Design a protein around this ligand. Sequence first.
Ligand SMILES: COc1ccc(-n2cc3cnc(NCC(F)(F)F)nc3c(-c3ccc(Br)cc3)c2=O)cc1
Ligand SMILES: COc1ccc(-n2cc3cnc(NCC(F)(F)F)nc3c(-c3ccc(Br)cc3)c2=O)cc1
Ligand SMILES: C[S@@+](CC[C@H](N)C(=O)[O-])C[C@H]1O[C@@H](n2cnc3c(N)ncnc32)[C@H](O)[C@@H]1O
Ligand SMILES: C[S@@+](CC[C@H](N)C(=O)[O-])C[C@H]1O[C@@H](n2cnc3c(N)ncnc32)[C@H](O)[C@@H]1O
Ligand SMILES: [Cl-]
Ligand SMILES: [Cl-]
Ligand SMILES: [Mg+2]
Ligand SMILES: [Mg+2]
Ligand SMILES: [Mg+2]
Ligand SMILES: [Mg+2]
Ligand SMILES: [Mg+2]
Lengths: 385, 385
Amino acid sequence: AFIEEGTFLFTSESVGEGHPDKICDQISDAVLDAHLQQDPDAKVACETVAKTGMILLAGEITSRAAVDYQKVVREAVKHIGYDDSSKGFDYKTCNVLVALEQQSPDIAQGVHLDRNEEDIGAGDQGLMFGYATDETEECMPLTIVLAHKLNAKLAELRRNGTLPWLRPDSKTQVTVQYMQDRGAVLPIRVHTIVISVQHDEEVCLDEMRDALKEKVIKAVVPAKYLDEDTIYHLQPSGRFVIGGPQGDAGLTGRKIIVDTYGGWGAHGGGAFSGKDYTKVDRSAAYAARWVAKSLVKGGLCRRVLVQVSYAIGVSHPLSISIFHYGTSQKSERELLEIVKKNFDLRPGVIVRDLDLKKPIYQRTAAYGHFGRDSFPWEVPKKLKY
Amino acid sequence: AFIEEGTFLFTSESVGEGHPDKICDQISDAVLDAHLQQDPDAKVACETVAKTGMILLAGEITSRAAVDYQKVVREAVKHIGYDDSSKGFDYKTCNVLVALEQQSPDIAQGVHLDRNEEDIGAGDQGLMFGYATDETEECMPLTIVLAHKLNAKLAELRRNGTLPWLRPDSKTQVTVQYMQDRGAVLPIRVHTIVISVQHDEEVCLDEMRDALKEKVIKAVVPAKYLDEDTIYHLQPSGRFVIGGPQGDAGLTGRKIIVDTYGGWGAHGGGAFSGKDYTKVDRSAAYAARWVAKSLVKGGLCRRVLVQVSYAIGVSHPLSISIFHYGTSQKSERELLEIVKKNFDLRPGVIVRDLDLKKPIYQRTAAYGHFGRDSFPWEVPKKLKY
Ligand SMILES: COc1ccc(-n2cc3cnc(NCC(F)(F)F)nc3c(-c3ccc(Br)cc3)c2=O)cc1
Ligand SMILES: COc1ccc(-n2cc3cnc(NCC(F)(F)F)nc3c(-c3ccc(Br)cc3)c2=O)cc1
Ligand SMILES: C[S@@+](CC[C@H](N)C(=O)[O-])C[C@H]1O[C@@H](n2cnc3c(N)ncnc32)[C@H](O)[C@@H]1O
Ligand SMILES: C[S@@+](CC[C@H](N)C(=O)[O-])C[C@H]1O[C@@H](n2cnc3c(N)ncnc32)[C@H](O)[C@@H]1O
Ligand SMILES: [Cl-]
Ligand SMILES: [Cl-]
Ligand SMILES: [Mg+2]
Ligand SMILES: [Mg+2]
Ligand SMILES: [Mg+2]
Ligand SMILES: [Mg+2]
Ligand SMILES: [Mg+2]
């Protein structure tokens, strides 16, 4: 397809609830939630690893909670849908191994011991970005929104029994052509869609490809974006019976771009799942999203990127910067002043503003952390200036 | 510090060879190299997990090689410097566990079985970006270059015995103020430096902070970038005796931004280490770097971002796009035509151009994959147009 000057292509991907990396993210956040339900101040850094027959928890937790890891892990796998050896993985019969220790006392003393909550230090150094774009109501890139919705539709049709050959492991990828608009972007058309999904031994390739087009793509992607030139790669490997952890090892924090903006904006490298609010990889990224979305919904920008960074043990961010892509009449200095007057990005203040001791994290761990369900970081702050 | 209009701050981080995530990347690539030394066509997808006393290998390998995983893992840990219980980890006495299976036959049949090498399919779907910037000779952002060099200097002074209290686990972070220059960027000054490094029980905080400034920062960062306003956070946690996997679990592919551009450019989410060339997460990212660097060294751009993407089982990229930040006199269409005429981004052609069956991967797995050592993707292609 021809690319008119002033237009361009961009691609993002998403994965389903049973993708092995996403299994790990969901388990790590189920463990976090289980701790927070009993101890709102639990210090949690839980990594999960998945391979054939195995969930391993590894990391550091200091908490007053009494958590039954066997039950928490197995219930999370059950929810995903891995409930029989015929599907490659079974919550009832898999191995759950635990290698969890207390948080390092050296970290604890440098971050939170004997500190006023508002003045707790960042739990690590790092950099984080927030992004928002007015191209969708939820202020997310269309590429990633569509990719997530394709995976959600697969899970829906698996769970409602209308495509009973589906299994839980899936991946999708969407390329959209955009029009430049004074620094903002406007979606024009869908250029290419990829869908791969684990399936039973009985269904044939043609039946699957027809269903993926008619029952999945057409039920998700508006027809105005699809044309005779759109390219479809549906079950492009030809066979995907082996899947889940049996097909590919999973680890927590290996889908960080799926979790955020689908490649748009920028990313500082930190993973979200399995971490309590003192880990700024999560809390500061959520707050940076909240700032970005507040700037767009407040009418100050159409598209905006925010970078923050921290040093371990230091509460205030080391610096904050705002880039508006040419979509604000205010200068970068002016936007920064507005942000500094309206937000306090210490982790011990973010926790209060975004209610980050609440056990809602398992809900964040599939289909992206941003752009859905009116989580606190998705509710814009009314800005004073 | 005041930010003049037309200037801005940007932050990147790096980690040392003994950071637990980086340990895992290095082990995963040591395993890959060991296979490639005997079987250049080995199919390798090796994840590593590290916690107190434990290295676990998990993933999928199909290979004609006979690899002694105990020896390969322990020699990699020895090289890093974890050789005694007093340091928190010891290659001689740790547990090495292996959960490695063959590559899924369903993947194999859809990717490479009975396919001409040049026509092998991508080993997965995904998106990848390449980036280059003329702000340094090696065409990398100064923020990340400096951050890497600070970690390398720590390892040097540990190994040469002049700072014998140092241990292998470290992290660094550098914020630079830049001047905008017609889409390119020009470094002005270093705004903030963070250094945290594991240390012995005997050395005091003041001795460490003085050494980190005088022997590390001053030996790495040109004095012209440092002034009386530069902020230093040196050992900001106050105590870092517990470190390595004992302090924090490590996993392969959890430092993907450290491995690439330090937050500049863009990232598609895929990890590099532990993967052979058929995994486009690695090979196509390397090729995209090669394209970007070729465009800058060829005088066509000063700063450039390239996105490619793939579907599993399909050899050619689904699309390619080039963004030059306003730093080329050529249009995006023209640059794309030049790229298409000069490069072939099928994985089975990338392998030949970049010599990706060679066992050099362990060398890539610390201090970034880009900007050093004249690896094949760092040697620009002479462009014809
Ligand atoms: C005057 O209004 C505008 C509005 C938007 C743009 N604009 C144009 C682009 C063209 N082509 C690519 N290719 C993707 C690439 F990865 F290959 F670069 N990207 C672009 C981007 C972009 C850059 C980085 C990221 Br992250 C995400 C999008 C872009 O903002 C220009 C002028
Ligand atoms: C006319 O010449 C130029 C030359 C460069 C720029 N330019 C300016 C920026 C200002 N401020 C931030 N803050 C970091 C932020 F994360 F908060 F946005 N970034 C910027 C960037 C930028 C954007 C995304 C990424 Br990735 C990396 C750098 C930038 O290119 C503008 C005009
Ligand atoms: C292709 S596998 C990664 C490569 C792999 N580790 C190997 O050994 O070659 C990555 C993801 O793709 C999906 N996948 C697994 N088997 C597949 C298949 N046969 N066809 C298509 N996608 C598959 C799963 O979501 C999986 O987590
Ligand atoms: C701070 S730890 C991550 C948080 C952690 N998992 C916990 O339980 O709170 C992340 C990295 O910081 C470094 N680190 C570990 N202990 C530290 C300490 N006491 N002071 C500073 N940095 C430390 C190591 O490089 C480690 O991999
Ligand atoms: Cl994957
Ligand atoms: Cl880390
Ligand atoms: Mg953590
Ligand atoms: Mg963007
Ligand atoms: Mg940009
Ligand atoms: Mg792989
Ligand atoms: Mg950039």
